[PDB]
Design an enzyme around this catalytic site. Structure first.
Site, mmCIF file in Angstrom:
data_model
loop_
_atom_site.group_PDB
_atom_site.id
_atom_site.type_symbol
_atom_site.label_atom_id
_atom_site.label_comp_id
_atom_site.label_asym_id
_atom_site.label_seq_id
_atom_site.Cartn_x
_atom_site.Cartn_y
_atom_site.Cartn_z
ATOM 1 N N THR A 8 32.787 43.975 15.783
ATOM 2 C CA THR A 8 33.443 45.288 15.914
ATOM 3 C C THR A 8 34.183 45.565 14.598
ATOM 4 O OG1 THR A 8 35.666 44.621 16.653
ATOM 5 C CG2 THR A 8 34.018 44.702 18.351
ATOM 6 N N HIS A 9 34.556 46.823 14.386
ATOM 7 C CA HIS A 9 35.394 47.144 13.223
ATOM 8 C C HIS A 9 36.715 46.416 13.523
ATOM 9 C CE1 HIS A 9 32.611 50.556 13.404
ATOM 10 N NE2 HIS A 9 32.909 50.798 12.140
ATOM 11 N N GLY A 10 37.447 46.023 12.502
ATOM 12 C CA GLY A 10 38.694 45.362 12.815
ATOM 13 C C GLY A 10 38.553 43.949 13.344
#
Lengths: 129, 129
Positions: A8-10
Protein backbone atom coordinates in the site's frame (compact mmCIF):
# COMPACT_ATOMS: atom_id res chain seq x y z
CA UNK A 1 0.83 -22.46 0.33
CA UNK A 2 0.20 -19.75 -2.22
CA UNK A 3 2.29 -16.72 -1.42
CA UNK A 4 0.64 -13.40 -0.52
CA UNK A 5 2.37 -10.02 -0.71
CA UNK A 6 0.62 -6.90 0.56
CA UNK A 7 1.53 -3.43 -0.71
CA UNK A 8 0.00 0.00 0.00
CA UNK A 9 1.10 3.64 -0.22
CA UNK A 10 2.60 4.55 3.12
CA UNK A 11 2.96 2.03 5.96
CA UNK A 12 -0.45 0.40 6.17
CA UNK A 13 0.44 -3.04 4.69
CA UNK A 14 2.31 -4.18 7.80
CA UNK A 15 -0.65 -3.15 10.00
CA UNK A 16 -3.28 -4.87 7.81
CA UNK A 17 -1.22 -8.06 8.21
CA UNK A 18 -0.94 -7.46 12.00
CA UNK A 19 -4.67 -7.00 12.22
CA UNK A 20 -5.24 -10.24 10.33
CA UNK A 21 -2.84 -12.11 12.61
CA UNK A 22 -4.66 -10.69 15.64
CA UNK A 23 -7.72 -12.48 14.25
CA UNK A 24 -6.10 -15.62 12.88
CA UNK A 25 -2.73 -16.08 14.64
CA UNK A 26 0.69 -15.53 12.99
CA UNK A 27 0.84 -16.26 9.32
CA UNK A 28 3.50 -17.94 7.23
CA UNK A 29 4.39 -17.24 3.62
CA UNK A 30 3.20 -13.62 3.67
CA UNK A 31 5.31 -10.55 2.74
CA UNK A 32 4.67 -6.80 2.63
CA UNK A 33 6.23 -3.57 1.41
CA UNK A 34 5.90 0.13 2.10
CA UNK A 35 5.90 3.02 -0.33
CA UNK A 36 7.45 6.31 0.70
CA UNK A 37 7.27 9.67 -1.17
CA UNK A 38 10.33 9.91 -3.41
CA UNK A 39 10.20 6.26 -4.45
CA UNK A 40 9.07 5.15 -7.93
CA UNK A 41 7.74 1.89 -9.39
CA UNK A 42 11.26 0.62 -10.06
CA UNK A 43 12.15 0.96 -6.38
CA UNK A 44 8.97 -0.93 -5.55
CA UNK A 45 9.73 -3.72 -8.03
CA UNK A 46 13.00 -4.30 -6.17
CA UNK A 47 11.21 -4.30 -2.85
CA UNK A 48 8.65 -6.82 -4.09
CA UNK A 49 11.44 -9.03 -5.51
CA UNK A 50 13.35 -9.00 -2.25
CA UNK A 51 10.20 -10.11 -0.45
CA UNK A 52 9.47 -12.86 -3.05
CA UNK A 53 12.99 -14.30 -2.63
CA UNK A 54 11.94 -15.23 0.91
CA UNK A 55 8.58 -16.71 -0.06
CA UNK A 56 7.50 -20.08 -1.43
CA UNK A 57 6.14 -19.03 -4.79
CA UNK A 58 5.85 -22.52 -6.25
CA UNK A 59 2.03 -22.57 -6.18
CA UNK A 60 1.70 -18.94 -7.16
CA UNK A 61 1.72 -15.35 -5.87
CA UNK A 62 -1.19 -13.06 -5.07
CA UNK A 63 -0.33 -9.35 -4.67
CA UNK A 64 -3.02 -7.58 -2.58
CA UNK A 65 -2.73 -3.83 -3.04
CA UNK A 66 -4.57 -0.74 -1.83
CA UNK A 67 -5.95 0.87 -5.03
CA UNK A 68 -6.14 0.31 -8.71
CA UNK A 69 -3.58 2.42 -10.58
CA UNK A 70 -1.30 3.55 -7.74
CA UNK A 71 2.45 2.88 -7.70
CA UNK A 72 2.09 -0.28 -5.54
CA UNK A 73 -0.41 -1.55 -8.16
CA UNK A 74 1.72 -0.47 -11.13
CA UNK A 75 4.85 -2.12 -9.88
CA UNK A 76 3.03 -5.39 -9.00
CA UNK A 77 1.47 -5.31 -12.49
CA UNK A 78 4.90 -5.28 -14.11
CA UNK A 79 5.93 -8.40 -12.16
CA UNK A 80 2.87 -10.55 -12.84
CA UNK A 81 2.61 -9.72 -16.59
CA UNK A 82 3.65 -13.01 -18.19
CA UNK A 83 3.76 -15.15 -15.14
CA UNK A 84 1.45 -18.08 -14.54
CA UNK A 85 -0.23 -18.12 -11.19
CA UNK A 86 0.58 -14.47 -10.45
CA UNK A 87 -2.22 -11.97 -9.90
CA UNK A 88 -2.78 -8.47 -8.53
CA UNK A 89 -6.01 -7.62 -6.67
CA UNK A 90 -6.74 -4.00 -5.67
CA UNK A 91 -8.96 -2.80 -2.78
CA UNK A 92 -7.48 -5.00 -0.09
CA UNK A 93 -9.56 -5.01 3.12
CA UNK A 94 -9.70 -7.12 6.27
CA UNK A 95 -12.59 -9.39 5.11
CA UNK A 96 -10.58 -10.21 1.95
CA UNK A 97 -7.37 -10.84 3.92
CA UNK A 98 -9.02 -13.04 6.57
CA UNK A 99 -11.04 -15.17 4.12
CA UNK A 100 -8.08 -15.53 1.77
CA UNK A 101 -5.66 -16.54 4.52
CA UNK A 102 -8.20 -19.05 5.90
CA UNK A 103 -8.87 -20.71 2.54
CA UNK A 104 -5.19 -20.85 1.64
CA UNK A 105 -4.59 -23.57 4.15
CA UNK A 106 -7.08 -25.93 2.51
CA UNK A 107 -4.86 -25.84 -0.51
CA UNK A 108 -7.26 -24.35 -3.11
CA UNK A 109 -6.26 -23.91 -6.76
CA UNK A 110 -4.89 -20.52 -7.79
CA UNK A 111 -8.06 -19.51 -9.73
CA UNK A 112 -10.21 -20.56 -6.82
CA UNK A 113 -8.23 -18.38 -4.38
CA UNK A 114 -8.25 -15.34 -6.70
CA UNK A 115 -12.06 -15.65 -7.16
CA UNK A 116 -12.63 -16.04 -3.40
CA UNK A 117 -10.48 -12.98 -2.59
CA UNK A 118 -12.47 -10.70 -4.96
CA UNK A 119 -15.82 -12.08 -3.81
CA UNK A 120 -15.12 -11.84 -0.06
CA UNK A 121 -13.51 -8.41 -0.44
CA UNK A 122 -16.67 -7.07 -2.09
CA UNK A 123 -19.14 -8.86 0.11
CA UNK A 124 -17.27 -7.57 3.14
CA UNK A 125 -18.35 -3.98 2.34
CA UNK A 126 -21.74 -3.65 3.96
CA UNK A 127 -23.68 -0.91 5.84
CA UNK A 128 -25.52 -1.62 9.07
CA UNK A 129 -28.65 0.46 8.44
CA UNK B 1 -18.34 18.26 7.02
CA UNK B 2 -19.71 14.87 7.96
CA UNK B 3 -17.53 13.29 10.60
CA UNK B 4 -15.66 10.04 9.87
CA UNK B 5 -14.30 7.70 12.56
CA UNK B 6 -12.17 4.71 11.58
CA UNK B 7 -11.89 1.65 13.82
CA UNK B 8 -10.12 -1.70 13.30
CA UNK B 9 -8.78 -4.52 15.48
CA UNK B 10 -5.17 -3.70 16.25
CA UNK B 11 -3.50 -0.49 15.05
CA UNK B 12 -4.39 -0.31 11.37
CA UNK B 13 -6.95 2.56 11.51
CA UNK B 14 -4.29 5.23 12.05
CA UNK B 15 -2.28 3.88 9.08
CA UNK B 16 -5.30 3.69 6.72
CA UNK B 17 -5.88 7.38 7.51
CA UNK B 18 -2.15 8.14 6.95
CA UNK B 19 -2.28 6.37 3.63
CA UNK B 20 -5.33 8.38 2.61
CA UNK B 21 -3.64 11.64 3.62
CA UNK B 22 -0.57 10.64 1.60
CA UNK B 23 -2.94 10.59 -1.39
CA UNK B 24 -5.18 13.52 -0.51
CA UNK B 25 -3.29 15.76 1.95
CA UNK B 26 -4.13 16.09 5.68
CA UNK B 27 -7.74 15.65 6.57
CA UNK B 28 -9.93 17.48 9.03
CA UNK B 29 -12.84 16.10 11.02
CA UNK B 30 -11.57 12.51 11.03
CA UNK B 31 -10.95 10.36 14.16
CA UNK B 32 -9.70 6.81 14.76
CA UNK B 33 -9.37 4.23 17.51
CA UNK B 34 -7.36 1.10 18.17
CA UNK B 35 -8.47 -2.16 19.71
CA UNK B 36 -6.05 -4.12 21.86
CA UNK B 37 -6.50 -7.69 23.23
CA UNK B 38 -8.04 -7.41 26.70
CA UNK B 39 -10.41 -4.61 25.73
CA UNK B 40 -14.17 -5.15 25.27
CA UNK B 41 -16.93 -3.28 23.44
CA UNK B 42 -17.56 -1.03 26.44
CA UNK B 43 -13.94 0.15 26.37
CA UNK B 44 -14.34 0.84 22.67
CA UNK B 45 -17.58 2.78 23.16
CA UNK B 46 -15.66 5.12 25.47
CA UNK B 47 -12.87 5.46 22.96
CA UNK B 48 -15.32 6.29 20.17
CA UNK B 49 -17.09 8.84 22.41
CA UNK B 50 -13.84 10.56 23.30
CA UNK B 51 -13.05 10.87 19.60
CA UNK B 52 -16.57 12.18 18.78
CA UNK B 53 -16.27 14.92 21.44
CA UNK B 54 -13.53 16.41 19.25
CA UNK B 55 -15.44 16.11 15.99
CA UNK B 56 -18.13 18.21 14.32
CA UNK B 57 -20.98 15.73 14.29
CA UNK B 58 -23.69 18.21 13.33
CA UNK B 59 -24.16 16.80 9.81
CA UNK B 60 -23.71 13.21 10.89
CA UNK B 61 -21.15 10.50 11.67
CA UNK B 62 -19.93 7.63 9.52
CA UNK B 63 -18.02 4.86 11.34
CA UNK B 64 -15.80 2.94 8.88
CA UNK B 65 -14.74 -0.37 10.42
CA UNK B 66 -12.70 -3.38 9.38
CA UNK B 67 -15.18 -6.30 9.46
CA UNK B 68 -18.79 -7.02 10.09
CA UNK B 69 -19.34 -8.45 13.57
CA UNK B 70 -16.01 -7.69 15.25
CA UNK B 71 -15.72 -5.65 18.46
CA UNK B 72 -15.01 -2.37 16.59
CA UNK B 73 -18.23 -3.03 14.60
CA UNK B 74 -20.24 -4.08 17.66
CA UNK B 75 -19.31 -1.05 19.69
CA UNK B 76 -20.00 1.37 16.78
CA UNK B 77 -23.38 -0.38 16.30
CA UNK B 78 -24.38 0.41 19.87
CA UNK B 79 -23.65 4.13 19.33
CA UNK B 80 -25.51 4.61 16.05
CA UNK B 81 -28.66 2.62 17.07
CA UNK B 82 -31.24 5.40 17.43
CA UNK B 83 -29.26 8.24 16.06
CA UNK B 84 -30.16 10.09 12.88
CA UNK B 85 -27.34 10.51 10.45
CA UNK B 86 -25.15 7.87 12.12
CA UNK B 87 -24.07 4.80 10.19
CA UNK B 88 -21.54 1.96 10.40
CA UNK B 89 -19.95 0.56 7.22
CA UNK B 90 -17.75 -2.56 7.41
CA UNK B 91 -14.95 -3.56 4.98
CA UNK B 92 -13.14 -0.25 4.94
CA UNK B 93 -10.48 -0.05 2.19
CA UNK B 94 -8.44 2.70 0.58
CA UNK B 95 -10.76 3.21 -2.46
CA UNK B 96 -13.69 3.71 -0.04
CA UNK B 97 -11.70 6.11 2.17
CA UNK B 98 -10.35 8.20 -0.71
CA UNK B 99 -13.67 8.53 -2.57
CA UNK B 100 -15.57 9.25 0.64
CA UNK B 101 -13.11 11.91 1.81
CA UNK B 102 -13.16 13.54 -1.64
CA UNK B 103 -16.95 13.69 -1.88
CA UNK B 104 -17.34 14.95 1.68
CA UNK B 105 -16.01 18.32 0.72
CA UNK B 106 -18.74 18.91 -1.85
CA UNK B 107 -21.17 18.75 1.01
CA UNK B 108 -23.29 15.73 -0.04
CA UNK B 109 -26.32 14.60 1.97
CA UNK B 110 -25.78 11.86 4.54
CA UNK B 111 -27.59 9.17 2.47
CA UNK B 112 -25.62 10.16 -0.58
CA UNK B 113 -22.30 9.77 1.26
CA UNK B 114 -23.24 6.40 2.79
CA UNK B 115 -24.30 5.07 -0.66
CA UNK B 116 -21.09 6.35 -2.30
CA UNK B 117 -18.89 4.77 0.40
CA UNK B 118 -20.45 1.28 -0.09
CA UNK B 119 -20.38 1.55 -3.88
CA UNK B 120 -16.76 2.77 -4.16
CA UNK B 121 -15.57 0.29 -1.53
CA UNK B 122 -17.00 -2.60 -3.57
CA UNK B 123 -16.01 -1.31 -6.96
CA UNK B 124 -12.49 -0.78 -5.65
CA UNK B 125 -11.99 -4.56 -5.32
CA UNK B 126 -10.84 -5.66 -8.74
CA UNK B 127 -8.33 -8.20 -10.16
CA UNK B 128 -5.90 -7.29 -12.92
CA UNK B 129 -6.09 -10.50 -14.96
Amino acid sequence: TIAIVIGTHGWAAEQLLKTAEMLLGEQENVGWIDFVPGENAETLIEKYNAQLAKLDTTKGVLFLVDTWGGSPFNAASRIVVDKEHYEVIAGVNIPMLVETLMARDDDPSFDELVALAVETGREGVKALK
